[PDB]
């Protein structure tokens, strides 16, 4: 019902560079967005719940920025072990997920 579009579909850089992911909601979702990372051959792990709250056991490197429809995830000083997909999902209504973003190198 609510479409979540993740951009870019893929993007890469070397270790240490700032990397930002953008997810946009078709309709209004008021900070009920979440970010997950799915390592290869693994189940998703929650990273950011709510618009910006950081889940327990998560490095301070990850940070989330919120809005009514435009949301972004920034990984300050990306390390070399953050090489998993990244899914944005909204829970304002029955949950839906974005197409995911692939991160490599």
């Amino acid at each position: 019902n609510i479409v979540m579009t993740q951009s870019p579909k893929s993007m890469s850089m070397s270790v240490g560079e700032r990397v930002t992911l953008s997810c946009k909601a078709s309709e209004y979702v008021g900070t009920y967005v979440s970010w997950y990372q799915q390592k290869p051959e693994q189940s998703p792990k929650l990273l950011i719940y709510g618009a910006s709250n950081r889940y327990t056991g998560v490095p301070d490197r990850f940070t989330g920025s919120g809005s009514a429809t435009d949301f972004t995830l920034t990984i300050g000083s990306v390390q070399a072990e953050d090489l998993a997909d990244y899914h944005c999902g909204q829970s304002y209504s029955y949950p839906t997920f974005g197409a995911g973003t692939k991160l490599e190198l």
């Binding site: 900070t31 829970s91 304002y92």
Partner: protein, 102 residues
């Protein structure tokens, strides 16, 4: 419509919607006592508010209203148009009849 807890900071009491946030505020179909307004819908958000006593959780709900212009059109706009037209009528009066134009 914002509500939260008095005296229980976020570390002690946290609020949450029972169902999906989009379905947690229900408006009865037959209950609407609005005279000159229309209720388009509502949206819920949950945030945090800072205060001197601590940091609290706030549940927010917005009711979107649009005013109805029907009353004002008859009340003011049409009378203004008619007064302007009556004021115009003065042009067609004969120049001799000064008192009528005054």
């Amino acid at each position: 419509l914002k509500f939260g807890s008095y005296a229980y900071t976020r570390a002690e009491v946290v609020y949450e919607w029972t169902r999906e946030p989009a379905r947690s505020v229900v408006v009865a179909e037959d209950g609407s006592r609005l005279n000159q307004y229309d209720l388009l819908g509502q949206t819920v958000d949950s945030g945090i508010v800072q205060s001197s006593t601590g940091e609290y959780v706030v549940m927010t709900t917005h009711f979107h209203l649009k005013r109805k212009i029907g009353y004002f059109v008859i009340q003011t706009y049409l009378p203004c148009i008619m007064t302007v037209i009556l004021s115009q009528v003065s042009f067609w009066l004969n120049r001799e009849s000064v008192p009528a134009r005054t």
